[PDB]
Amino acid sequence: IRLSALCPKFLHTNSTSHTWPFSAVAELIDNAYDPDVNAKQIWIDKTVINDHICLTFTDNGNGMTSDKLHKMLSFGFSDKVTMNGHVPVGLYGNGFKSGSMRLGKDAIVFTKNGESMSVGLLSQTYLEVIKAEHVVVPIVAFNKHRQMINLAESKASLAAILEHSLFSTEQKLLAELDAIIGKKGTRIIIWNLRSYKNATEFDFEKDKYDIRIPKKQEQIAPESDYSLRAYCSILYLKPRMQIILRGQKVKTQLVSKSLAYIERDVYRPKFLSKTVRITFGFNCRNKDHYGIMMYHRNRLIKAYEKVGCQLRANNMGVGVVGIIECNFLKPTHNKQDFDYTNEYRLTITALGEKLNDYWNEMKVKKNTEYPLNLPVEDIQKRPDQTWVQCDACLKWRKLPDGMDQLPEKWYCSNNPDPQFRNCEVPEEPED
Amino acid sequence: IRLSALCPKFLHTNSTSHTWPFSAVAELIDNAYDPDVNAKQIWIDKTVINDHICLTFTDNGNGMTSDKLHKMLSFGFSDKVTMNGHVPVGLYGNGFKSGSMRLGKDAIVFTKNGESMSVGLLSQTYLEVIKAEHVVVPIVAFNKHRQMINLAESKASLAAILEHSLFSTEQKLLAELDAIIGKKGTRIIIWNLRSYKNATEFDFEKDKYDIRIPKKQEQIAPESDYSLRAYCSILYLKPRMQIILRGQKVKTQLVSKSLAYIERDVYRPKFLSKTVRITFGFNCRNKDHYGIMMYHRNRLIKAYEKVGCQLRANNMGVGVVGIIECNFLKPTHNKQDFDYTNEYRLTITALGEKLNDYWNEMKVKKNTEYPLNLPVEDIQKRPDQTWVQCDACLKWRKLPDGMDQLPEKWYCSNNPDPQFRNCEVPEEPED
Ligand SMILES: Nc1ncnc2c1ncn2[C@@H]1O[C@H](COP(=O)(O)OP(=O)(O)NP(=O)(O)O)[C@@H](O)[C@H]1O
Numbered sequence: 090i091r092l093s094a095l096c097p098k099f100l101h102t103n104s105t106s107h108t109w110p111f112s113a114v115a116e117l118i119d120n121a122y123d124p125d126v127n128a129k130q131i132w133i134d135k136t137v138i139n140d141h142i143c144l145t146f147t148d149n150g151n152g153m154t155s156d157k158l159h160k161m162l163s164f165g166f167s168d169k170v171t172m173n174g175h176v177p178v179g180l181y182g183n184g185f186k187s188g189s190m191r192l193g194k195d196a197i198v199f200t201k202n203g204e205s206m207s208v209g210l211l212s213q214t215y216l217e218v219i220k221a222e223h224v225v226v227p228i229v230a231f232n233k234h235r236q237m238i239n240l241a242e243s244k245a246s247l248a249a250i251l252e253h254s255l256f257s258t259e260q261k262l263l264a265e266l267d268a269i270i271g272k273k274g275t276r277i278i279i280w281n282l283r284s285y286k287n288a289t290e291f292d293f294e295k296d297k298y299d300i301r302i303p304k305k306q307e308q309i310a311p312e313s314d315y316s317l318r319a320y321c322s323i324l325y326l327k328p329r330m331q332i333i334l335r336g337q338k339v340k341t342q343l344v345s346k347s348l349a350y351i352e353r354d355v356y357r358p359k360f361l362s363k364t365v366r367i368t369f370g371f372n373c374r375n376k377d378h379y380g381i382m383m384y385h386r387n388r389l390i391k392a393y394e395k396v397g398c399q400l401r402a403n404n405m406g407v408g409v410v411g412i413i414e415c416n417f418l419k420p421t422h423n424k425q426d427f428d429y430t431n432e433y434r435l436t437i438t439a440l441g442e443k444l445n446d447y448w449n450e451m452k453v454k455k456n457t458e459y460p461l462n463l464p465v466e467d468i469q470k471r472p473d474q475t476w477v478q479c480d481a482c483l484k485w486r487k488l489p490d491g492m493d494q495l496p497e498k499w500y501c502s503n504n505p506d507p508q509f510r511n512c513e514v515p516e517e518p519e520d
Numbered sequence: 521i522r523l524s525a526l527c528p529k530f531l532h533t534n535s536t537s538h539t540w541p542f543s544a545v546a547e548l549i550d551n552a553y554d555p556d557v558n559a560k561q562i563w564i565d566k567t568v569i570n571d572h573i574c575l576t577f578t579d580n581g582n583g584m585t586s587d588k589l590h591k592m593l594s595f596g597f598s599d600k601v602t603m604n605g606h607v608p609v610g611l612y613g614n615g616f617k618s619g620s621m622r623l624g625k626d627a628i629v630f631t632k633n634g635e636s637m638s639v640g641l642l643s644q645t646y647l648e649v650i651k652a653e654h655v656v657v658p659i660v661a662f663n664k665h666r667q668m669i670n671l672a673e674s675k676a677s678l679a680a681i682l683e684h685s686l687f688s689t690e691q692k693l694l695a696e697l698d699a700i701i702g703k704k705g706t707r708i709i710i711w712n713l714r715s716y717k718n719a720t721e722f723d724f725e726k727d728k729y730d731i732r733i734p735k736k737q738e739q740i741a742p743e744s745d746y747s748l749r750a751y752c753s754i755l756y757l758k759p760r761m762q763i764i765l766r767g768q769k770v771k772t773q774l775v776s777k778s779l780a781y782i783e784r785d786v787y788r789p790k791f792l793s794k795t796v797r798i799t800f801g802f803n804c805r806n807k808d809h810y811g812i813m814m815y816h817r818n819r820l821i822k823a824y825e826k827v828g829c830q831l832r833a834n835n836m837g838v839g840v841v842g843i844i845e846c847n848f849l850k851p852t853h854n855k856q857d858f859d860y861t862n863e864y865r866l867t868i869t870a871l872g873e874k875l876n877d878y879w880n881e882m883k884v885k886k887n888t889e890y891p892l893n894l895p896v897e898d899i900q901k902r903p904d905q906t907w908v909q910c911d912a913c914l915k916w917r918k919l920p921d922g923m924d925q926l927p928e929k930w931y932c933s934n935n936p937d938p939q940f941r942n943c944e945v946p947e948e949p950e951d
Pocket residue numbers: 116119120121125126148150151152153157160161162166167168169178179180181182183184185186275
C-alpha cells in the first residue's frame with residue numbers, strides 16, 4: 090500500500106496561510122518558548138552570508154536528536170505536553186514548515202542536545218535544482234567529539250548540504266554549530282527572503298534594532314502591526330523566555346500590569362462552568378491604541394479589538410484596554426484569530442458591556458478629583474505597578490512606585506524590596 | 521537522503537484552514553468545474569450507508585487514471601492549465617485533502633476515465649485503527665472489464681478497503697462504480713461528518729433540497745452564509761457546469777445580469793496597465809443584501825462587501841450591488857478573501873467612489889420619473905435582462921422581457937428568439 094506523497098510545491102502552498110509576515114516569525118519564537126525546548130533566550134538577527142540576506146534564530150534550549158530533527162522537518166509530528174504549569178502553544182506540527190517557508194525559500198537548522206549535534210536542510214531551491222518530485226531533507230549527525238554518526242545517510246546528505254546550502258565547506262558549516270554558545274541549543278538560518286522588486290519584504294535599515302514592515306484589516310496602525318520589536322513586547326501575557334532582537338533585548342512586559350486605573354473583574358459565561366479573569370485599565374503610552382487584548386495559552390491572538398461603545402464611535406471608551414485569556418475559544422489562522430463561533434460572539438458581547446461599565450464608572454470616579462470637562466482619556470498616566478523581569482532567573486518582580494529608567498539588565502539583587510532580593514524567593518502573586 | 525514524512529495528524533491540521541464549512545464544499549465543486557475534469561454536472565447529496573450519514577459528490581467529467589488518483593490523494597501535485605478560455609481555479613494541490621477532511625474524517629473516491637477504473641481511500645479512522653505513523657492511501661485498479669490490474673499493490677489495498685471502509689464486500693464497492701452513470705466520471709463519499717453533541721454540523725432536515733448551517737464576520741446574514749443552495753447560485757460569475765443539490769438543480773445565474781438599473785463602468789488603476797470591468801445595479805430579491813461581489817478567475821471570493829457611503833451608515837447605497845472580477849488581486853484563506861495589500865486598499869477605495877457616483881446618479885434619474893420622497897431602494901425591480909442556461913449545451917441565452925416562471929429544464933429550442941434557437945449558435949455577447 091503506497092505512501093501519500095509530498096511534492097515540493099507543497100512547501101510553498103503550506104506557507105500561504107501566513108499573510109502577515111510576523112505570524113511566521115511568531116511560529117519560530119513559539120517553538121523556543123515551548124516547554125520541551127524551554128529556552129531562556131532567543132536571538133533574532135539580520136546577517137549577510139555568501140552575499141545573501143539572512144534571518145537567524147538562535148536559542149539556548151534543549152536542542153534535538155537527529156531523529157526529532159527529521160520529525161521537525163516533517164509534517165504533523167507534534168507531541169508537546171505541559172511541564173510544571175508551562176503549557177505548550179504548539180500542537181499541529183506545522184509551525185516551523187509554514188513559518189520558515191513564509192519568510193524565505195530555504196532554511197537550515199543546526200542543533201545540539203548535549204550528547205550530539207545535527208544539521209538539516211529544508212530548501213525549496215535545492216529541491217527545484219535537482220528536479221525532485223518528493224521533499225527530501227538532508228540530515229547529517231555529529232557526536233560530542235565532532236565525528237559523523239549514521240554515516241549511511243550522512244554521506245549523501247553532506248554532499249547535498251555543502252553544494253546546495255550557504256556553506257561551501259565542512260568547517261564553515263561546523264562554524265555555525267559553534268555559534269550556539271553553550272552545550273545545548275539550536276540555530277536556524279533562512280535565506281532567499283521574500284522580495285518585491287529588488288529589496289526584501291522587511292525593512293532592516295529604518296531602525297538598526299528592529300525589523301519593520303514598509304496597517305492591517307483597517308484608524309491608525311498600532312506599532313505592533315509593523316514593528317517586530319513592538320509585537321514581541323506583547324506576544325506573551327506573562328513572558329518567560331527573553332527575546333533579543335538584533336542584539337538589543339526586547340522589553341517584554343507583564344501585559345496585565347502595563348495599565349493605569351486597573352480594575353479586575355470576572356466573566357461568568359453560561360456555556361461554561363468556569364470563571365474567566367478580566368482586567369481593564371487605560372493605556373499609558375498612546376491613548377490611540379485601545380480595545381481588548383485576547384490571549385490563548387499565554388500567547389497573543391488578537392490585539393486592540395474594539396468592543397462595546399468603542400464600536401459606536403471614536404468618542405467613547407478611548408484609551409480603555411481590556412485583557413482576557415480565552416482558553417475556551419479556538420485559535421485559527423496560525424494563532425492570529427478565533428473561530429467565529431457563538432461562544433466567541435457572546436464573549437465579545439459580554440466584554441463590551443463590562444467595558445462600558447468600567448468606562449462610565451471611571452468617568453464618575455474622575456469627576457470627583459479632576460475638572461468635569463477634562464476627559465479621562467487625557468489625564469497623563471503611568472502603570473499602577475511596574476514589574477520587571479530578573480535577567481538571571483526570569484522571575485517577575487514588583488517595583489516600588491516612581492522607578493522609571495531601569496537599566497537594560499536587572500537582577501533580583503537590585504531589588505529595593507528586601508523580601509524579594511534573591512532569585513530563590515517565589516514570584517509574588519499578581520492578586 | 522530521507523524523505524520528509526507525513527503523519528496522519530496532519531490530515532486534521534491541514535483541514536483547519538476551513539472555518540466556514542461551505543469553503544470545503546466549494547473545493548470539491550471547483551475540482552469538477554476545472555477544465556482538466558470539465559464535468560457538465562455535479563451531484564451533491566446526503567445519504568445513509570452502513571448506518572453512517574454520508575456526503576456524496578458525483579460528477580460526469582473525465583475521471584482519473586490510478587496514478588493521478590494517487591496524486592490527488594497526495595499533497596502539492598497540481599498541474600492545471602487553461603483550455604480554450606476556461607482557466608482553472610485550482611493551483612495549490614491541496615483543495616481535496618483540506619476540503620474532504622474538513623467535512624468528515626474519512627473519504628473514498630471512485631473514478632472511471634473510460635479506459636480504466638480505480639478507487640482510493642483517504643481515511644483518518646483507518647490510519648488511527650492501524651496505528652500508522654505515515655499516511656498511506658489504499659488504491660485498487662480495474663479495467664474496462666472489471667478485473668484488477670497492478671495486483672501487487674491492489675491486494676493489500678483491497679484488504680484494507682473492504683475491512684476499513686463502508687463497503688464490506690467487493691460487489692458493494694463495485695456497485696458505487698456503477699453509480700457513475702456514463703463511461704467517465706468520479707464519485708466521492710465522505711462519512712464520519714463533523715458533529716457537535718450528537719447530530720451533524722449541517723442541517724439536512726430543515727429543507728429536504730438544501731444543506732444548511734444551524735451569520736459570519738458580523739447586519740442580517742445573506743442566505744449564502746447559511747444555505748448551500750444560495751451559495752452555489754452565486755459561486756461562479758459565468759457558470760458552465762451545473763450543480764444538482766439533493767436531486768434539485770441549483771438555479772445558478774449569470775451574476776453580472778441579475779441586477780436592475782445596470783450601469784457598466786471600468787476601473788483604471790494606476791498600478792496596472794489594464795482596465796477592469798465593473799457593473800453596478802440594484803438587487804432585485806432583497807434590498808438588504810448589497811455591496812460588492814468580488815470574483816477571481818470566475819470564482820466568488822468575497823460577497824456583499826460594503827464600500828463607499830455604505831460604510832458610513834445604513835442609510836446610503838442600500839440595495840446597490842457592484843460586481844468586479846479582480847484577477848490582479850491575490851486570493852487567500854481557501855479562496856474566501858484577498859491578501860490585504862495596497863492594491864486591495866486602492867481597489868476598495870475606487871470601488872467606493874464609483875459606487876457613490878452611481879447611487880447619486882440613480883437618485884437623480886429616479887427623481888425625474890417617481891416622487892421625490894420615494895427612495896430608489898424601495899421601487900420594485902426585476903432584472904434588466906433575464907438569461908437562462910441551456911440544459912443540453914450549457915450556453916447562456918438572453919430571453920425577451922416579461923418571462924418569469926421558466927421550466928426547471930430549458931433548451932435552446934424553447935427560445936422565442938429565432939436567432940438563438942439551436943445549440944450551435946455561439947453565445948450572444950453580454951455587451
Ligand atoms: N528551536 C527548536 N528547538 C528544539 N526543538 C524544536 C525547535 N523548533 C521546533 N522544534 C521541534 O519541532 C517540532 C515541530 O515544530 P512545529 O512545526 O512548529 O510543530 P509544533 O510546534 O509541534 N505545533 P505547531 O507550531 O502548532 O504547528 C516541535 O514539535 C519541536 O519538538
